[PDB]
Write a protein that binds this DNA or RNA. Sequence first.
RNA 1: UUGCGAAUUCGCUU
RNA 2: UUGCGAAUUCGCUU
Length: 271
Amino acid sequence: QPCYLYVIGMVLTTPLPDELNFRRRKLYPPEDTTRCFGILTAKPIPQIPHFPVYTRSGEVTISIELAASGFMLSLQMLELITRLHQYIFSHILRLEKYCVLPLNVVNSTLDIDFKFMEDIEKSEARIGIPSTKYTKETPFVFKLEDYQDAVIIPRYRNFDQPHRFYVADVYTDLTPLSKFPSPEYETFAEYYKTKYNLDLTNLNQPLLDVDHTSSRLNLLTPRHAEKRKAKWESLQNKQILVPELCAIHPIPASLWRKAVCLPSILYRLHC
RNA sequence: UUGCGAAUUCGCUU
RNA sequence: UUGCGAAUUCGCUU
């Protein structure tokens, strides 16, 4: 059966304006990273007009364009594409339900990203918290570049259902020896040692700012006892995390952002 | 424009 | 050997 390959093109046509940026976030135009999502089908998709999704960075125009058609794909790659499609909806978006898949340029030409897919399948941070053994002779090593476009997960808690945070900022002027925001602890180091019996091998690493990854499923409209949830969500966002204590997720942050738009788009397309 | 957990008071059936 | 709904007080993050 011949295939049709469609790109879910994405542009931030209207950036979030000041009076709407209450949380004072950075703006993230999806068109600043080449990797993105597309749709694979056994039957073509009728020409649908441009429609908006409303994101934290503002108004993103969605566009479904045909990449290729009438081609064949090996059963092997189809099994790969399908496994990925399932991965994004159950493990990445945590939902319950032809094929959605990542695309990326080859060197202007956009194509199915099989390498990136095999990477995800090979990651030991694809599903849960991985086991990493830092000692004095093999201390945690900080690579600033690995934290430029990342989603992270605390290795030390929430084993059942791990949290995922966007790295919002890297604070080069802080260390695990920096003063703790709460008085009962002098330092982050002491805090993680006192509370979680955690020891650090690297006392010179910058600390990380974080932003929660969760969002509502429907973004077709702008976001413009519940008090207890607001206080909690606020402290969640104000958390400062130690890089050594977190695992980096194989899905980069700029693609994680595009992925949370997907239910809004599939739902729109099929209605 | 996003949480689970524990108490407590109360509405809803014939 | 089986419920949903509304208030309220509180614990859990850094």
